[PDB]
From Swiss-Prot, chains A, B:
MRNA binds at residues 22, 171-174, 176, 199-201, 227. Displays methyltransferase, positive regulation of the poly(A) polymerase and transcription elongation activities. Involved in the modification of both mRNA ends and in intermediate and late gene positive transcription elongation. At the mRNAs 5' end, methylates the ribose 2' OH group of the first transcribed nucleotide, thereby producing a 2'-O-methylpurine cap. At the 3' end, functions as a processivity factor which stimulates the activity of the viral poly(A) polymerase OPG063 that creates mRNA's poly(A) tail. S-adenosyl-L-methionine binds at residues 39, 66, 68, 72, 95, 97, 116, 138. GO terms for biological process: 7-methylguanosine mRNA capping; methylation; regulation of mRNA 3'-end processing. It comes from Vaccinia virus (strain Western Reserve) (VACV). The keyword Protease does not apply. This is Cap-specific mRNA (nucleoside-2'-O-)-methyltransferase. Residues 163-291 are annotated as: Binding to Rap94. The gene is OPG102. It is found in: Virion. One of its GO terms (molecular function) is RNA binding. GO terms for cellular component: virion component. Residues 163-243 are annotated as: Binding to NPH-I.
Amino acid sequence: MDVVSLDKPFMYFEEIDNELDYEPESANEVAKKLPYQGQLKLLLGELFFLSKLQRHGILDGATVVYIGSAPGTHIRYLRDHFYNLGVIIKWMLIDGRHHDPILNGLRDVTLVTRFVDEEYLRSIKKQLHPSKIILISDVRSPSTADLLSNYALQNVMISILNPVASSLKWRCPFPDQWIKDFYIPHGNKMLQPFAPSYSAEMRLLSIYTGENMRLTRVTKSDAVNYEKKMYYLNKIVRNKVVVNFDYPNQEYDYFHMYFMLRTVYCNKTFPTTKAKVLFLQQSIFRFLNIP
Amino acid sequence: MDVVSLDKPFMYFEEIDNELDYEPESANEVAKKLPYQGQLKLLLGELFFLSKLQRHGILDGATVVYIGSAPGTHIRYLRDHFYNLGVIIKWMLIDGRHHDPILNGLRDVTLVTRFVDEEYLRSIKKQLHPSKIILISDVRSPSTADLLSNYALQNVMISILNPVASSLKWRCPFPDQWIKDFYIPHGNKMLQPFAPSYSAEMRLLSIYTGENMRLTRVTKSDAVNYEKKMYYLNKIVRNKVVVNFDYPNQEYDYFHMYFMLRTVYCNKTFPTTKAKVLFLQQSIFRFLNIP
Ligand SMILES: Nc1ncnc2c1ncn2[C@@H]1O[C@H](CSCC[C@H](N)C(=O)O)[C@@H](O)[C@H]1O
Ligand SMILES: Nc1ncnc2c1ncn2[C@@H]1O[C@H](CSCC[C@H](N)C(=O)O)[C@@H](O)[C@H]1O
Ligand SMILES: C[n+]1cnc(N)c2nc[nH]c21
Ligand SMILES: C[n+]1cnc(N)c2nc[nH]c21
């Protein structure tokens, strides 16, 4: 067994303290071990992101605009969690595909069937006005050309929507398929528990202060760095069984999940963090139908 | 006579401490009082900007890429000034129109006859590599649509060229002709002595640290502010005769010129700032053929 003892898990990209040459043979390995793992991945990251905003007092009274929301099964759990905590949020889910019907019938959530373009963003900005906007993007066209297009749209989402905070899908193009340098919004590179086995995708979390927008250039050398750090994280780290982690499951991804879940707010009071986390995890797994 | 006593002149937009409702009748008033005033305006601002970079030690060894450089008569004085100071700079002047022939025959200055587009910027970036770039933009298409187009090109100049510093033409569209909000690079809003009588144009001076690019949104309310502050500056301030300014010319624009010129470096040593400024001014006026 691949056992180890860790203090904490890598929560952000910059914390990864080692690298590995990417082995293309890893692409043939099992990418997922849990049913509905994709919904789990998104639910944990978005709970984490939204709990942070609550902590900064910018969540209550906002309209969350989620683009690339369908099917969005896990979004029902999110909505329920904050609704039950008494936070007042309006949800606007926009995607050209259809949403899971469990999202229907809620006055606080509006489902829109439309693929957004710059023009449409403008009309929704005019219509949402003057509410504060929290943007969540999970759009997917992929080729490096596809990604760049996606990233360009995401930056236009921020410039037109002018949100108070954003969570953007972020996966750096592979160095061997570079096309050109580009800019992405400055934010924290949140790592994701339960991401596919060899995924290099993370989540860019930004909070907008003032009327300023800070971007950061991404170069091929950066792409080489993303590749090696994420490959090290995926091949070595995530395959560890944290033995000093006294929890029903000691696999790295659960150890990492624990640290995200400990930051979530609850109504029920618990005697220990461990109790709250186990509660939240059980709750999450039952909702998503994960044994 | 409209006399007053001032400590210093307004050097940047944020220093303007008052405003006035714009009177459209001002547009019918004499816009210029000096021959070649347009060349004078650009020469002073660019001397100011470049002297600052020298002060930060980022000028020597750089290639200055000036887009919208023609005719560019005044650029010859600039080139001569730093060349004679021993600073090593390569100049690349690009414009679809033709440059003043006084710019020909210098190995350190390359004249290009081309209207730049995004694609061309890419090729010049590849060709200038690996030299450090200082960007100067003075492109002119105007309608608010024209301006926006200009500003969008200027931001693409920075993203593709990735300069160490930039000086960009900046005039906010009029509030009564607003189209949409937009972003401009963060920088200092340098005011310009000898600008047309009622011009609201200034120069955006930015220095790029790290791999970050900071932008700032400009809204119609901002446009209203630019209009009133610049109108106050133009109608009231610039029409003052600074009597406590012991100089051959006490008109505000000369008082303002003095403060820009005092920051310029010379070979000759002077006993007082006043002597250096008078020297630089005389030199400048003679070159441009201004009595
Ligand atoms: N311009 C655009 N506007 C809206 N949705 C877009 C888009 N381009 C792609 N998409 C959507 O991006 C989605 C990626 S999969 C999204 C999964 C979803 N976040 C979940 O919680 O289940 C696709 O459904 C696709 O239709
Ligand atoms: N894409 C583009 N590339 C280069 N020059 C451009 C341009 N669009 C407009 N211009 C140029 O912008 C200029 C504005 S007037 C420039 C004056 C010059 N800076 C001086 O020192 O004399 C015009 O000459 C115009 O041809
Ligand atoms: C799927 N995949 C393809 N090509 C790469 N270079 C790569 N690196 C990580 N994952 C990868
Ligand atoms: C030339 N011009 C036209 N319209 C305006 N609104 C304006 N403000 C300053 N100058 C102006």
